[PDB]
Amino acid sequence: LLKKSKYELKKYNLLVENSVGYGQLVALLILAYYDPDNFSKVSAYLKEIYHIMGKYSLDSIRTLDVILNVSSQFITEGYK
Amino acid sequence: FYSKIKMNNRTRYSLEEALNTEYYANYDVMTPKLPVYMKHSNAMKMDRNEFWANLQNIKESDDYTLRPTIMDISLSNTTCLYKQLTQEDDDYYRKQFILQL
Amino acid sequence: KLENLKDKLPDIKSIHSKLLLRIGKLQGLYDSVQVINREVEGLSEGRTS
Amino acid sequence: TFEHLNRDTLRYINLLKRLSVDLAKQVEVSDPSVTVYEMDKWVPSEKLQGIL
Structure with a gap:
């Protein structure tokens, strides 16, 4: 109990620890590939990602894994 | 839809x-782009x-710095929960419930 | 800062009423294009008057 | 109010590309040296573009 509640970082590493916080991260990336306007509002989608994984304490390693995993289905048209 | x-x-x-x-x-x-x-x-x-450019100046100001998330589902309000999941125009609120399940 | 929440409310009533205006405009462009595609179909049938 | 402004800017995004009714194309050509035609660069008339 000393190195669980005093030293362990409070982050969520799997897709079941936050089904609510990871469910809004995928649906925001599905939305970003269906915009006609995608180069004028790049920095409007980052500032909504940082507010999603700050509110729900999502991991920073598993989050970069979900971004590279969803963006490989849409690599033929949107790679810019 | x-x-x-x-x-x-x-x-x-x-x-x-x-x-x-x-x-x-x-x-x-x-999707015919x-x-x-x-x-x-x-x-x-x-x-x-220049419509998106002054929607960001609302969300970059130091006045509306207390606001919910764009992809947020309501739970308290029983009227807005039925109005989010039934409109056949957006379909990003019925994809979260499939991903959550 | 949350005590008033008074002069910060009508500047969101403004940007929300312009967005409901821009929706109804582009919902009207997709209803006059569907008039052009009803005439070009009927005219290229062969029956004009 | 923010819970209404957020929902009406997702159906504006979902209306410019996804369902997005478009025109039916008649191909007109004038020069006799083309012989190949890709149906991506068909643009409408000059009088219809000014009206739309």
Whole structure:
């Protein structure tokens, strides 16, 4: 109990620890590939990602894994 | 929701085949990225990009710095929960419930 | 800062009423294009008057 | 109010590309040296573009 509640970082590493916080991260990336306007509002989608994984304490390693995993289905048209 | 996208671009594939009756067509049911008249028009781009540019100046100001998330589902309000998951126009609130399940 | 929440409310009533205006405009462009595609279909049938 | 402004800017995004009714194309050509035609660069008339 000393190195669980005093030293362990409070982050969520799997897709079941936050089904609510990871469910809004995928649906925001599905939305970003269906915009006609995608180069004028790049920095409007980052500032909504940082507010999603700050509110729900999502991991920073598993989050970069979900971004590279969803963006490989849409690599033929949107790679810019 | 998926039967308004299927029947929109299946009639005009039956209408290519009649007007210039040289070539048949079976394409996919996809996202036609911009139709033909929204593709190359700088009068429609420039007034649309200055609508998004003053929607960000609301969300960059130091006044509306207390606000919910764009993809947020309500739980308290029983009226807005039925109005988010039943409108067949957005369909990003019925994809979260499938991902959560 | 949350005590008033008074002069910060009508500047969201403004940007929300312009967005409901821009929706109804582009919902009207997709209803006059569907008039052009009802005439070009009927005219290229062969029956004009 | 923010819960209404957020929902009406997702159906504006979902209306410019996804369902997005478009025109049916008649091919007109004038020069006799083309012989190949890709149906991506078909643009409408000059009188219809000014009206739309």
